[PDB]
Design a binder for this molecule. Structure first.
Ligand code: NAG
Ligand code: NAG
Ligand code: NAG
Lengths: 446, 446, 446
């Protein structure tokens, strides 16, 4: 019939979502047959490997993609039009992140997740084990991000970022701390974006002298998009083992719900309202077109983000699916998506704002109005250079709580349920710019 | 006369082999005049340096050669012909390595190197000094190689590979070990081969759009082959100091022979039979042509392998000498030699199989038939990703002995005679693919 | 009037030198209002940051500049003319460094900086804190530099150099030390220069086959020079915070003068005589043209060197200002300046020679004539690969003093006044080759 007509023509849509429900089904099946203790750590890592091979194999594409697509992108058009394009671009992610994070305030205020339950049983959450975090100061973090932009060595910017630590070497008579930088390991995605855009304007500022080299990076981009076409077919195999691997690791019974499940129901709902009902309403108001036609065409990287739980490890999947399944130009789509991959971490900002209210709803705190705007503007500003580190939501939450001087006594309670909720973060994180990609397609016609 | 006619026209053949006998002559001359103690470690490293400068200066060529020649190679012809070419290729190294390693079994079985001699005086071999090796588990090693293929960061794949260690951090109540990866330093040659072939097909899959970039990497390959032409003339100077440097370092008297010299006579003979009598017989059976005409034309990298004692540090020397001194096409020779440099370590597999029989010939062990095929199939499979580390034959021998549960009580006896026998490994290691290069030249005519 | 005519047309000359006097004015103003203790280390690093952002942002340009300009430079002309050009080039920096360092001998001999003052009060200088330096041996340092030329991995040559340390692992019965190399972090500028020149000849040795790739690196150089045009305008903002940052850090009162100020008056005068009176006299003798017309046109990188206090972090500023403000050809100026940035550290050699006389003028030492030529030829030879490390003058002074066996008992006295005098080193260091750039412009006409 015609049911097999839409079956073959939408195979990637069908094969991906049948895999993510297979991972939950396989994951609960192994936990029902004993679990990780039934297998042991010998045969455990062999089970989680063929999914973990995908998350490794996909990250090697973004170094010859991000630094190569921006030069081919941001050299076709005029620099005055680019600053015209960049002004509407950078304004869009800022308004989205403020509106998403303020949604997390009132959703967590008018629900009270600090309920008389096992959530207020947080005496198990302290545990005296990993209390003394590094927890860098709030001035040094925003100082670090500006230093992380414009990297020191350009080859060093491909695998190691810049960070800062603290040394207690002042035993002069006053035991005070001093900062020192050591360049810990993790890919500096933000540092290479700001180079390639600045380098891309310089070819445009040259005349026909740089006509050879703009054709070079245009071609080098194009073969990579052929190479990522083959990666997409392995992605239904990998996500089946990402989800099923993670279920076996953590004890997902008794602590999933019935201990703090009011909080998980709160923060998933914040990801449910924003991006699925809020961002399509913004897209409908500017385009007067059906957003769910546009949203269905990019369903494969959204399920990939729920597999990988990484925002930057779905960027090549998104750049293909927006370009092919929906009508966008090449240069205008292969420009806004890399820069809009590491500046608009609003699903983090939705997560990071609620959890700070969550521990303040308990333990009797009084954030009436002055603390609300400080906890709003700091979360939308800290969520810029939060790309490389895996548990960035836990690490950058301490600098929120220090600047609004709330108790950080049990941050371990937000931890160990963040394999699930931050997995929903990257779904919403890569969803905003993709709608923002098609939003700029509207009035680029005029 | 005409003796000076063949002298000038075969200068590289004459000048190289007169240097390797000069290194043995110079090395025994310094050891006769006291030795390393007569010079002291101050003036010692100045003596070994101008050879060690060659082994450093040569390795910097293989990064813009391996990743550049494969793209220019594996993009001219069809992908269906490539998989046709790769199937005969990958089958050839597997049959060669099995036939070479099984030759080591019967040569070590029907000679009994565990003789009533100073070889069974292994009480000096234990010494209680470096017994507790890391000695990674046999599942984790083949898990590591698949993870070492498809590297994480492509810039990180140029100088640091991936490995795995063990941490004892499980003091939960059961003191068990856990694996963790840390990316130790050493060039990931295997990780870059599998990228450049996959990247090379992607240009072929593009039409005339990638016509610019295939001409780029074709040219970038060509200037490097001009640059390696100048390196070849320094090679008779360097090998004179590699050999003469190594003789002064180790005490080469009394322990060379007359302690375990039956073993060295056994394993050099295995390198003597295979590759000099076995591999020419295979080449004669498929080509009906004189193999020693072909074997004499590549005598300069074979003596370079006996100098450098490194398989991958003779690849640019081999790619020139096969292309010029013998009749092969450029694209078919500059493709099979990089991929056949890090997959066919059969001289290691000849070494690694005999030494496991050697310590089992002594200490009264009973490998009748079941242990023979396990010690055969594991040695031919572990010898794939053994490129970067210098003492790979000693390190990967422990994972052979664990999987066939033989005593590893004196592995230090195989050590400290491995400067000589593994120096004969790289001779046979780079000899197989060069014969395999001309073997594919036969029926590429049809 | 016409005073505003020369104001706008020489804005970079005016705006740069008004900033360096603003940094001394701002720096003494903050130290007068308490100082660093008045601010505290919290708000201290925020004050020194916008200057430190310049020194970071500028270093990322020299990797796609040094390795790219030399190939485009050293491939236009003939290799016989290049060796003709390189012979006059390498002779010029050697004669300059000998003449500059011998000027430091007689200026320090016939002034006696070891005066009966607080300089001979060096009992505060010992302090028993950091006496046990690594202080590598004099043979191993020149062995290290030759090994640092021709790097191991070409990607590894972009951010980590090679060095050597010492391990005490010989507890055989004689407690002696052994060298071992570990590749500490710092950009290998010298290792990439010697590759790109050798690689640049190889394109010239090819005919029209490499005509594509020489046009590639010619274009890739050109867009970088457009990119450094924008960096120059930020440089008056940065140098205002480099100088004012450094004044607040060190206690610049009482120890600046009146403790060892005879020495600082001696070594600044050596930088004052050479390069301002000696090198223009050499330039006048070969060109018969006004050197101060030529010297005024490059005043902006000279003040940048006094800001950054780094020789290699002014190379892109110098390559533009020589090319535009003065009449030189592009290929002959974008070749001699990178190779003449890391071979002619004569301002270091002026510094490093006087300080060794300085501690020998005190403590009653007898360098009559034999020690004078050894302290002269070693300082002009050690000052080759001294690029990457910040405090290279302190570190390489110990290998001078060991080879002329003077007491190293207070090397900390030369330290902590080296923020000022080595800041004058990089002024004279980048001044010699720029005069040498225009010196080769004279008889390139014939
Ligand atoms: C949790 O809180 C309830 C009351 O809300 C209390 O009865 C119970 O003992 C607490 N602890 C646990 C482990 O359930
Ligand atoms: C080595 O073995 C021989 C017997 O073959 C014996 O005579 C000799 O003492 C042994 N040497 C040592 C050091 O044990
Ligand atoms: C420094 O030297 C002067 C001599 O001019 C002497 O008066 C003073 O006591 C010395 N100070 C110290 C701390 O040695």
């Amino acid at each position: 019939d015609q049911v097999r007509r839409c079956l073959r023509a939408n195979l990637l849509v069908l094969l991906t979502v049948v895999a993510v429900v297979a991972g939950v089904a396989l994951g609960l099946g192994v936990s029902g047959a004993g679990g990780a203790l039934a297998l042991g750590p010998e045969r455990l890592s062999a089970f989680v490997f063929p999914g973990e091979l995908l998350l490794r194999l996909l990250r090697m594409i973004i170094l010859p993609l991000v630094v190569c697509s921006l030069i081919g992108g941001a050299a076709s058009l005029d620099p005055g039009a680019l600053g015209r394009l960049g002004a509407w671009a950078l304004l869009f992610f800022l308004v989205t992140t403020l509106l998403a994070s303020a949604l997390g305030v009132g959703l967590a205020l008018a629900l009270q997740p600090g309920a008389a339950s096992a959530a207020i049983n947080a005496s198990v959450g302290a545990a005296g084990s990993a209390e003394n975090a590094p927890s860098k100061e709030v001035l040094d973090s925003f100082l670090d991000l500006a230093r992380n932009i414009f990297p020191s060595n350009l080859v060093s910017a491909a695998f190691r970022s810049y960070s800062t630590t603290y040394e207690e070497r002042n035993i002069t008579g006053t035991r005070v701390k001093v900062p020192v930088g050591q360049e810990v390991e993790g890919m500096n995605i933000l540092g290479l974006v700001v180079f390639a855009i600045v380098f891309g304007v310089a070819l445009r500022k040259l005349g026909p002298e740089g006509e050879l080299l703009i054709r070079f990076f245009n071609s080098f981009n194009e073969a990579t998009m052929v190479l990522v076409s083959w990666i997409m077919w392995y992605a239904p195999v990998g996500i089946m083992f990402l989800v099923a691997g993670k279920i076996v690791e953590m004890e997902d019974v008794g602590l999933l719900f019935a201990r703090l499940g009011k909080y998980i129901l709160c923060c998933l709902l914040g990801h449910a309202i924003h991006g699925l009902l809020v961002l399509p309403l913004i897209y409908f108001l500017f385009t007067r077109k059906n957003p769910y036609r546009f949203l269905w065409g990019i369903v494969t990287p959204l399920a990939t983000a729920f597999g990988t739980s990484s925002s930057s490890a779905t960027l090549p999947l998104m750049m293909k699916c927006v370009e092919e399944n929906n009508g966008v130009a090449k240069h205008i789509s292969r420009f806004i998506l890399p820069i809009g991959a590491t500046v608009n971490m609003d699903g983090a900002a939705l997560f990071q704002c609620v959890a700070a209210v969550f521990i303040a709803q308990l333990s009797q705190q009084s954030l009436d109005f002055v603390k609300i705007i400080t906890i709003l503007v700091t979360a939308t500003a800290s969520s810029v250079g939060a790309a490389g580190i895996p548990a960035g939501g836990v690490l950058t939450l301490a600098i929120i709580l220090e600047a609004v001087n709330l108790p950080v006594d049990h941050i371990s309670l937000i931890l160990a349920v963040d394999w699930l909720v931050d997995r929903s973060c990257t779904v919403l994180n890569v969803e905003g710019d993709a709608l923002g990609a098609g939003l700029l397609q509207n009035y680029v016609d005029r």
